[PDB]
Amino acid sequence: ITGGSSAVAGQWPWQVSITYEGVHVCGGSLVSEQWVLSAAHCFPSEHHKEAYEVKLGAHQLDSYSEDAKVSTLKDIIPHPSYLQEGSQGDIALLQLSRPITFSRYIRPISLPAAQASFPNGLHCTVTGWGHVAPSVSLLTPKPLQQLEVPLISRETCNSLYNIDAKPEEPHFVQEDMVCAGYVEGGKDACQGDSGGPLSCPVEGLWYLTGIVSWGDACGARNRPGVYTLASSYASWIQSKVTELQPR
Numbered sequence: 001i002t003g004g005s006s007a008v009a010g011q012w013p014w015q016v017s018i019t020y021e022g023v024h025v026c027g028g029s030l031v032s033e034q035w036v037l038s039a040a041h042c043f044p045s046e047h048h049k050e051a052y053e054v055k056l057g058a059h060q061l062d063s064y065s066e067d068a069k070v071s072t073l074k075d076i077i078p079h080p081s082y083l084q085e086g087s088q089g090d091i092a093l094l095q096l097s098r099p100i101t102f103s104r105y106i107r108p109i110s111l112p113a114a115q116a117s118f119p120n121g122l123h124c125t126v127t128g129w130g131h132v133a134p135s136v137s138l139l140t141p142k143p144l145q146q147l148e149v150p151l152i153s154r155e156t157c158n159s160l161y162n163i164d165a166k167p168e169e170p171h172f173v174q175e176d177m178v179c180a181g182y183v184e185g186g187k188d189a190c191q192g193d194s195g196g197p198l199s200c201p202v203e204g205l206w207y208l209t210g211i212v213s214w215g216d217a218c219g220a221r222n223r224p225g226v227y228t229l230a231s232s233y234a235s236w237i238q239s240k241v242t243e244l245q246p247r
């Protein structure tokens, strides 16, 4: 996250860190005791399931905490429509090896229904431990960063992405995607934020509106972050989780 601030411990208790071979690669959002939602693109086919971990209840990734818990994965379920980068369906259900116990620092975020609308301009928050500037990693001890971002329609977003575009480097915001951020840049999600929450306030609660997906250069003007809409997958998530792990 570039241009944000450090959250306070426990503020975003659904935020998880996903690591591959012990290195943070992506965020995720806890959605039940044994399920995490992240980005499909965080889980390429060449990676081995056994090398992933999920760290929950963390604030400073580098700091010891008796509140943080680390898990392996039993299942990685990318949405079947995700074919390649920029594809629709950049979303994955992750089943933890075992169920965790909710705590003050580990709590799920509510999923929106399929027809949840989050209107343009809504001030949502994206969080993560990804880069704080182009190719600049968050400094140890890696306190979770947060950034308030207003929602930007895919239509506006597409037109912004066209400004000074390289015709070879296309960027198309699809119907399952939304943007959020600022036309002048300097404030966005960045590399290593992928997979994490865009959390939006609705009726006193917080919903997982978006999953950090892609953009252009960290904090580039005319390039607000692109997110997969969780609402687009609410039916699929409910179906998958209900069949695989009925309550």
Ligand SMILES: NCCCC[C@H](NC(=O)OCc1ccccc1)C(=O)N[C@@H](CCc1ccccc1)C(=O)N[C@@H](CCCCN)[C@H](O)c1nc2ccccc2o1
Pocket: 025, 026, 041, 085, 086, 087, 090, 130, 170, 171, 172, 173, 188, 189, 190, 191, 192, 193, 194, 195, 212, 213, 214, 215, 216, 217, 218, 219, 224, 225, 226
């Ligand atoms: N390197 C600086 C420049 C980065 C720009 C790049 N854009 C791009 O390729 O457009 C292609 C396109 C073509 C056609 C239609 C649309 C899009 C980009 O966003 N790539 C994603 C990962 C790949 C990806 C690309 C398209 C879709 C889905 C996934 C990335 O970096 N996502 C970050 C979060 C970024 C948050 C908003 N800026 C997450 O944290 C993470 N995923 C990563 C995977 C590997 C390594 C680092 C990663 O970081």
